[PDB]
Structures are given as structure tokens and as C-alpha cells.
Amino acid sequence: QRNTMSKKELEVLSQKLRALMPYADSVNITLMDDVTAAGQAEAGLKQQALPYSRRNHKGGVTFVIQGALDDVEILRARQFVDSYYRTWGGRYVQFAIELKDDWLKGRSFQYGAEGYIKMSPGHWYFPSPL
Amino acid sequence: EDEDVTFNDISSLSKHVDEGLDGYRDYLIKYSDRELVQFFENAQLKRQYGEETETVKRDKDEIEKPSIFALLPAY
Incomplete structure (x- = not known):
């Protein structure tokens, strides 16, 4: 294309x-075919049951794998990625793998369009739409 | 003693009496230790409104005219 x-x-x-x-x-x-490339990537992640998000751009596709991952997941992930890369190279599809803790460090919040964070009972933070 | 007309009704009388004691609350507060005053105040809030009420930690403070029963043992 x-x-x-x-x-x-x-x-x-x-x-x-x-x-x-x-x-x-x-x-x-x-x-x-680019559609073929992208499809084989996404089918491989589903085949490995990994949690992911997909993002599309004019000229590339980014799969973001992030959060709290088990040792098994980390191993499977790195094996698959290394295999795919050897075939297609890193020029069109990218994989981002990141370990994250709890998103807000274990405290209560409202996630609506008017969301906010409870720092402590009696303390509101209103940082951003959550 | 002051003979000038000053109060009319229950709210004005209770405020007149309360206002008359600030000359002595200012004394107790001026010599009591801020940390003790804070302890006896918080421990009363947790009796009345329940221990889940937020522990105040008024570390930088204007102690909001604390009750004299809480203020006196700190002195």
C-alpha cells in the first residue's frame, strides 16, 4: 500500500x-500486505491470552501491554515478541511492555467525567478527569 | 455589671454570656501547650461524632475556641 x-x-x-x-x-x-502483518501480531497476543490495547496510526500499529503481570505472562510475552520481531522487524508494529503498580496507589476515587481522588477521608483532590 | 442595654432574647443572651468568658479563654490558651490542647480536643470529637471522624492534625493551627472542659486539664 x-x-x-x-x-x-x-x-x-x-x-x-x-x-x-x-x-x-x-x-x-x-x-x-500490512493487514496481514497487523493481523498476525494481534492473533499472536490473543493466542497467548495477554492483556493489551491496540492503537492505529497513519503508518504504524502500537500494542500496549501494561499493568501487574505474572511471571508466566512476562515469560510468554518476551518469547512471542522475540519470535515475531525476527520475522517482520520493528519498522511497522511496536510492542510496549511496562510493569505498573495500582493505578492510583490504593485509594478511593470517582472515575466519571467529574472524577476526583480521596487523599484521605475529608480530603478531595480534583486533579483531572479520571 | 454593665448597665447598658445589651440583650433581648435567648440567642442574644447565650451569646452575651459566652462572649463574657473570652477574657479567660484567652488566658488558658496563652499558657497551655498546643500539643495537649490538640489531644484533648480530638479525643472529645471522637467521643461525640465517632472515631471514624477525620483526625484533625491541626499542625498549623487556629484552635477554634476550644471547649473549656477540654482546655482546662491541658493547662
């Missing part, structure tokens, strides 16, 4: 790569 090149241009590109790699006899250019 993202490349609009003519066959002649592709041939020229091929020849220049061949000039950069003096040990290679020829370079074969193959066109792949």
Missing part, C-alpha cells in the same frame, strides 16, 4: 542493492 513505484524504479532499486552487496548475485523484491 505505502509504496507507489513503477517496475522500472523497482528494477533500478534492485540494481543499486546488488551494487551494495558484492557477494550477492541478485536481489528479489517481494510485496507484502
